[PDB]
Amino acid sequence: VIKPEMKIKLCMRGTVNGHNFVIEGEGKGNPYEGTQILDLNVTEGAPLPFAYDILTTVFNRAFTKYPADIQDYFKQTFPEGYHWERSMTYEDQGICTATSNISMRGDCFFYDITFTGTNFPPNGPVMQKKTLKWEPSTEKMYVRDGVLKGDVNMALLLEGGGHYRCDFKTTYKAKKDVRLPDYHFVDHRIEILKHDKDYNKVKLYENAVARYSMLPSQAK
Amino acid sequence: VIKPEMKIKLCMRGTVNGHNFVIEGEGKGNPYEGTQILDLNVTEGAPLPFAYDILTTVFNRAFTKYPADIQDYFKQTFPEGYHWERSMTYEDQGICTATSNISMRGDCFFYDITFTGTNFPPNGPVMQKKTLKWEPSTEKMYVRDGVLKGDVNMALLLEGGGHYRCDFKTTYKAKKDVRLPDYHFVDHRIEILKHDKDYNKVKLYENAVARYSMLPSQ
Amino acid sequence: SVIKPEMKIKLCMRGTVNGHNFVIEGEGKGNPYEGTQILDLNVTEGAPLPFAYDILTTVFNRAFTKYPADIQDYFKQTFPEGYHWERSMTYEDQGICTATSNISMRGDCFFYDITFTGTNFPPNGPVMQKKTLKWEPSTEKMYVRDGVLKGDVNMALLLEGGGHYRCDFKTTYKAKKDVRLPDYHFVDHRIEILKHDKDYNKVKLYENAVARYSMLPSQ
Amino acid sequence: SVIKPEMKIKLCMRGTVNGHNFVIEGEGKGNPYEGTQILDLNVTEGAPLPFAYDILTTVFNRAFTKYPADIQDYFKQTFPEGYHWERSMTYEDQGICTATSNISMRGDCFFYDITFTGTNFPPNGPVMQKKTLKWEPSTEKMYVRDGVLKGDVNMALLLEGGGHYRCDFKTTYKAKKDVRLPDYHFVDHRIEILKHDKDYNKVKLYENAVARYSMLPSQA
Numbered sequence: 001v002i003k004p005e006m007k008i009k010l011c012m013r014g015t016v017n018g019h020n021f022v023i024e025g026e027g028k029g030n031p032y033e034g035t036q037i038l039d040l041n042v043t044e045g046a047p048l049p050f051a052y053d054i055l056t057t058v059f060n061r062a063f064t065k066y067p068a069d070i071q072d073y074f075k076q077t078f079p080e081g082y083h084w085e086r087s088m089t090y091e092d093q094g095i096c097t098a099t100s101n102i103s104m105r106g107d108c109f110f111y112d113i114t115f116t117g118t119n120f121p122p123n124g125p126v127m128q129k130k131t132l133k134w135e136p137s138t139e140k141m142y143v144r145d146g147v148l149k150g151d152v153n154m155a156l157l158l159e160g161g162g163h164y165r166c167d168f169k170t171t172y173k174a175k176k177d178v179r180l181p182d183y184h185f186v187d188h189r190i191e192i193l194k195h196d197k198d199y200n201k202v203k204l205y206e207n208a209v210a211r212y213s214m215l216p217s218q219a220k
Numbered sequence: 221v222i223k224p225e226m227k228i229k230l231c232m233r234g235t236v237n238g239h240n241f242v243i244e245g246e247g248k249g250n251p252y253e254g255t256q257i258l259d260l261n262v263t264e265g266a267p268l269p270f271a272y273d274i275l276t277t278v279f280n281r282a283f284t285k286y287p288a289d290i291q292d293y294f295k296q297t298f299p300e301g302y303h304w305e306r307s308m309t310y311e312d313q314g315i316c317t318a319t320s321n322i323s324m325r326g327d328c329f330f331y332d333i334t335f336t337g338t339n340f341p342p343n344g345p346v347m348q349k350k351t352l353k354w355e356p357s358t359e360k361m362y363v364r365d366g367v368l369k370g371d372v373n374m375a376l377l378l379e380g381g382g383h384y385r386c387d388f389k390t391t392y393k394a395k396k397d398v399r400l401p402d403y404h405f406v407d408h409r410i411e412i413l414k415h416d417k418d419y420n421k422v423k424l425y426e427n428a429v430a431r432y433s434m435l436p437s438q
Numbered sequence: 439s440v441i442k443p444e445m446k447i448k449l450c451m452r453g454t455v456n457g458h459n460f461v462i463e464g465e466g467k468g469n470p471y472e473g474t475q476i477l478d479l480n481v482t483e484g485a486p487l488p489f490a491y492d493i494l495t496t497v498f499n500r501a502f503t504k505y506p507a508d509i510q511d512y513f514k515q516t517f518p519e520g521y522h523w524e525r526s527m528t529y530e531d532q533g534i535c536t537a538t539s540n541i542s543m544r545g546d547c548f549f550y551d552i553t554f555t556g557t558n559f560p561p562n563g564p565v566m567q568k569k570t571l572k573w574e575p576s577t578e579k580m581y582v583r584d585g586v587l588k589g590d591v592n593m594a595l596l597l598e599g600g601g602h603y604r605c606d607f608k609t610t611y612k613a614k615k616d617v618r619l620p621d622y623h624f625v626d627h628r629i630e631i632l633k634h635d636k637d638y639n640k641v642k643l644y645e646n647a648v649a650r651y652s653m654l655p656s657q
Numbered sequence: 658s659v660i661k662p663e664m665k666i667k668l669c670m671r672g673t674v675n676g677h678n679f680v681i682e683g684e685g686k687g688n689p690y691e692g693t694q695i696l697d698l699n700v701t702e703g704a705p706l707p708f709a710y711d712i713l714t715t716v717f718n719r720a721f722t723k724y725p726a727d728i729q730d731y732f733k734q735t736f737p738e739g740y741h742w743e744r745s746m747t748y749e750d751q752g753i754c755t756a757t758s759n760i761s762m763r764g765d766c767f768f769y770d771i772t773f774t775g776t777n778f779p780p781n782g783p784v785m786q787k788k789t790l791k792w793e794p795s796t797e798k799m800y801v802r803d804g805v806l807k808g809d810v811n812m813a814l815l816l817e818g819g820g821h822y823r824c825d826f827k828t829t830y831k832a833k834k835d836v837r838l839p840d841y842h843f844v845d846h847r848i849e850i851l852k853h854d855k856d857y858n859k860v861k862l863y864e865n866a867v868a869r870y871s872m873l874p875s876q877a
Contacts, residue, residue, distance in 0.1 A: 015319050015334055017305070018303045018305065018319060018321065018393065083238045085237070085238065085338040085339055086338060086339075087313075087315035087338050087339060089315075091532060092530075092531075093307075093389065093530060095307035095309075095315065095317060095389075096317070097315060097316070097317045097336040097337075097338050098336075098338075099235050099238060099336060099338065101238065114235055114334075114336060116317040116318075116319060116334060116336045117317075118305040118306060118307050118317045118318075118319065118391070119305055119306075119307055119389060119391050121365060122365050122366075123365065135798075135800075135841050136871035136873055137798070138796035138798075138843065140793075140795070140796075140811045140813060142793075142813060142821045143820070143821075144341075144820060144821070145341060145342050145343065146342075147342075151811045151823065152811065153798045153809045153810065153811055155798060155800055155841065157841070162801075162802060163800045163801075163802070163841065165800075165809065167811075167825065169313060169315075169338075169339055171338070171339050173238065183793050183813065183815070183821065185796065187871060187872060187873060188873075189871055189873040189874075189875065191875065191876055191877050193876060193877070205876050207873045207874075207876075209872070209873065212794075213794035213845065213847055214845060214867070215794055215845060215846070215847040215865045215867065216847075216865075217847065217849065218847075218849055218851060218863050218865070219791075219849040219850060219851050219863070311750075311751060312749075312750075313749060355579075355581075355622050355652075356651075356652030356654055357579070357652075358577035358579075358624060360574075360576075360577075360592045360594065362594055362602045362604075363600075363601075363602075364601065364602070371592045371604065372592065373579045373590045373591070373592055375579060375581055375622065377622070381582075382582070382583065383581045383582075383583070383622065385581075385590065387592075387606065403574050403594070403596070403602065405577065407652060407653065407654060408654075409652055409654040409655075409656065411656070411657050413657055425657055427654050427655075429653075429654065432575075433575035433626065433628055434626055434648070435575060435626055435627070435628040435646050435648060436628075436646075437628065437630070438628075438630055438632065438644050438646070454757050454772055456743070457741045457743065457757065457759070457831065522676045524675065524676065524775075524776035524777055525776060526751075526753040526776050526777055528747075528753075532745075532827065534745040534747075534753065534755060534827075535755070536753060536754070536755045536774040536775075536776050537774075537776075538673050538676065538774060538776065540676070553673055553772075553774060555755040555756075555757060555772060555774050556755075557743035557744060557745050557755050557756075557757065557827075557829070558743050558744075558745060558827055558828075558829050560803060561803050562803065583779075584779055584780050584781065585780070608751060608753070608776075608777055609777075610776070610777050612676060
């Protein structure tokens with residue numbers, strides 16, 4: 001069902017700081033290698049008045065390299081697919097939510113996305129477009145109430161060299177009965193490969209890899 | 221331009237726990253008295269699988285009784301209007317956001333609303349519809365960076381007794397330059413006065429009054 | 439009843455904020471059924487304090503609360519044995535403070551044994567640069583949870599220049615014995631520093647608190 | 658260098674959780690460059706503890722971290738003068754703990770002066786009911802802010818029954834002298850109770866901690 005190469009099509013409807021916008025994307029990736037590339041176009045609301053980086057992790061954990069010894073919640077859930085829900089709590093009290101309904105037809109994933117951003121300070125690094133990238137990260141994956149949660153401490157690198165923190169809490173909900181994983185980690189590195197001046201066109205890459213801890217247990 | 225009686229029309233497009241919905245409403249109230257009634261209809265996604273109460277405060281601070289010694293940020297901004305943004309952090313990590321763009325044509329307010337709910341536990345009081353009402357509340361109003369913030373500790377009274385807590389942080393953003401208020405309070409009491417079985421049809425009322433502290437300064 | 443219309447207060451606080459250890463002693467008195475009280479506070483170790491004194495003030499007793507008769511008073515009925523309370527204070531710039539208080543009584547005197555810890559205040563923030571003027575008056579939401587009484591309050595420091603710096607308080611109040619619990623209600627506050635010396639080595643502090651239900655009628 | 662291949666540890670903690678005062682002494686030793694250590698802890702007042710001991714364990718020194726040559730070691734650099742740390746621990750059911758530790762050195766021994774406060778734990782929650790099995794292994798995000806080092810980590814307690822109970826840690830580590838500051842990096846941990854007596858009056862405690870950059874390469 002999940003092919004070695006899969007295409008992607010998406011549509012995000014968003015509001016941030018009261019500015020409405022729509023973004024469409026198309027791309028492709030390699031689910032079993034945990035890599036993917038998307039081409040994103042702002043089709044309504046351009047140019048965006050806020051840092052593009054707040055959006056980029058909203059643009060599918062099917063694209064994760066899972067070792068054989070950890071259950072792959074994400075690839076098991078197709079063709080039926082899954083949705084996810086996320087809260088993003090920034091350290092200056094900007095709060096974003098997003099939801100994404102993920103389906104499959106043929107060799108293509110489709111995502112139907114909403115994004116809301118609230119309460120960003122006008123002089124803060126989001127509304128002043130002071131961000132450079134997300135740092136790579138490690139997301140903690142755990143089962144709760146029969147679905148999978150993933151929490152990650154994310155940080156934007158800023159112009160100037162400091163960081164701006166955001167706490168992600170995501171719940172990933174399979175539309176079929178899959179084998180559930182044990183507690184584990186997904187290491188990520190998301191990167192904008194290219195963009196025009198106002199980020200109306202963006203080329204976006206993510207590498208993600210699941211694992212257990214590298215440290216052995218002593219209490220055994 | 222804000223009349224003694226104003227009408228209201230609204231539209232909400234919402235998603236909670238992945239469930240999309242659309243609610244339309246109409247009503248009216250008395251802005252200088254701080255009271256209003258709305259009639260709300262679920263037009264898509266009926267029946268809602270969650271507690272209707274999580275939406276009700278999202279269905280306009282123009283409907284507030286302001287004494288003359290507190291600047292009224294809300295009434296000053298019309299006819300151009302204002303927009304607001306809110307986060308609602310529940311104690312069990314459900315997080316909702318909402319935005320509303322509020323305009324006026326004649327004797328009628330219009331609201332264009334989004335609502336997103338994330339990460340509600342499936343056996344919690346929201347997804348199990350165990351809520352009875354919001355308690356009345358006291359919102360704290362303070363100026364920040366030229367606009368008006370209001371924060372309020374909210375609580376849902378639950379079936380069975382006990383409360384479920386939610387922290388609201390709102391930013392209200394005037395579309396023209398207004399006189400800003402000093403720190404103050406808005407007391408509220410919101411109530412669903414009638415509903416049908418599945419809350420497809422709701423009649424909703426709010427009373428809100430602004431004030432300084434009732435305690436004198438030493 | 440052992441809560442007399444006039445009661446005295448004695449307290450000791452051991453604290454640490456931003457790594458700086460300190461000890462504060464206080465003595466005072468108030469009128470419990472009226473909701474008013476006065477304290478004289480002296481820093482006995484770690485002076486001068488490197489942070490805004492206002493972070494400490496609400497930790498220096500809900501026994502000093504005016505309770506209308508239709509609202510159950512959780513607090514006075516806990517005595518003579520008393521009660522303890524535990525509090526988290528989460529500031530908007532990620533400073534987080536905890537405090538605990540054990541409140542006992544002998545004769546016409548309350549005694550408080552207090553701890554305070556402050557973590558992660560930004561070095562240029564209004565706490566460590568002492569930019570605060572006062573707390574604003576407040577409304578605390580009181581609700582039963584798990585057989586004890588919780589109170590949550592959105593607090594705000596007025597700062598030099600008229601902006602505010604927000605703090606969310608979450609307190610649990612726990613009677614040493616079983617007592618009748620209240621319905622949901624509110625406690626309004628106004629806390630004020632009446633006098634201080636330049637480094638806040640000596641502070642005179644006042645509070646007024648009054649419980650109520652909502653003044654708005656119900657439909 | 659004053660940091661020897663093997664260092665001893667002595668510590669005193671004064672704490673309060675849920676109204677319950679206690680004092681815990683400890684002694685042990687570790688290998689700072691290997692990132693490993695063992696402590697033996699003894700409750701000297703307030704025994705037996707009425708709460709899950711796990712809440713205390715990460716408060717019982719990042720000098721014990723294996724740092725690679727390409728990441729600056731904030732912690733080793735700050736001795737003999739030492740450092741202090743400040744920590745908030747926010748649990749998902751509104752329990753909030755703080756801790757502070759002052760870390761000094763004489764000869765081949767570290768000394769820690771520790772406070773711990775725990776507030777607002779629910780009485781039927783897993784803390785007060787002693788339902789915790791262990792912390793999961795974790796990945797702490799390390800970043801400089803205002804000339805000192807912060808570390809944030811998403812922690813989880815494994816519970817009886819197999820679910821997890823989340824806690825968000827925010828730490829600030831503050832050197833007592835000038836040191837070379839590191840770039841953004843990670844510290845992987847695995848903390849374990851190796852042995853304990855019936856009421857946890859005596860506990861033998863191990864940590865392994867290792868600093869790293871991300872394992873994933875950049876496409877930028």
